[PDB]
Design a protein around this ligand. Sequence first.
Ligand SMILES: Cn1c(=O)n(C)c2cc(Nc3cc(N4CCOCC4)ncn3)ccc21
Ligand SMILES: Cn1c(=O)n(C)c2cc(Nc3cc(N4CCOCC4)ncn3)ccc21
Lengths: 131, 131
Amino acid sequence: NLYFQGADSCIQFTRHASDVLLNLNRLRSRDILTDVVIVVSREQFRAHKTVLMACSGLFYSIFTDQLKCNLSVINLDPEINPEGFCILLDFMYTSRLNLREGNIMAVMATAMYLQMEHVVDTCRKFIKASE
Amino acid sequence: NLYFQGADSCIQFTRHASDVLLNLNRLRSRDILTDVVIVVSREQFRAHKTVLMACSGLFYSIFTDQLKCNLSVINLDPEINPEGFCILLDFMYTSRLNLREGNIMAVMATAMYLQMEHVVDTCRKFIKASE
Ligand SMILES: Cn1c(=O)n(C)c2cc(Nc3cc(N4CCOCC4)ncn3)ccc21
Ligand SMILES: Cn1c(=O)n(C)c2cc(Nc3cc(N4CCOCC4)ncn3)ccc21
């Protein structure tokens, strides 16, 4: 079955969280209900504020601020690598992190800036493996 | 580890989808970035349109409609049981479905109206078990 008896005796759906995330990524692909543009140098990325907040300490801080919560455009530090941001945005909507030898440093620096602790820790572990 | 090599050779995070959903429910609890009120008889439920759309065929249809996508208030059919709606809204944000002998009929009728196929199928299976 697609469900099981949970620890609290309630029925839990095994694939529900991943199916929700898949549907949120489908909305992103079709630009449905996206409510912010993240600007990274000459690059623009449309997204859903709630997903960004759910994945990043920096976005959580920005969108819980009474002044910034209403902004439709967010400019990141111009030092941020757009490819590193793209890889992390894709991870937020899929659970899949496309780490490669050529992007791991940029991805790690971007995850540190975005306050994505588990991603930072994972990048550090993979870097340590080559060293 | 909190990650594994996925089928596509990419690294996948095991708990990411459930952690995102947990954070979206935390935003709901604090009324952060909620952008719609669902009205069910004398009861009001605040939520995030994207989560509702990701979980329900009816909400997907409503919020992809050019006229309705902008509505901040959505009134459901007055025949809908508020407790059944509450149980389903909680399920959307948690993966946990609080089915009980006393609510299963209302939950099933509400899931049919909301076009939540897997929930409908599960209710039908549990009803069949007692019969
Ligand atoms: C540091 N950090 C990190 O690595 N990730 C993945 C983060 C996600 C959030 N996103 C939240 C947090 C949150 N609560 C923490 C604050 O008190 C209220 C509940 N609620 C919703 N969204 C924040 C920081 C993160
Ligand atoms: C019938 N039904 C159901 O049981 N559940 C749980 C449903 C969820 C959605 N939510 C979507 C669907 C969706 N795509 C289907 C339509 O073409 C584009 C991609 N994309 C995002 N969100 C819809 C119907 C559902």
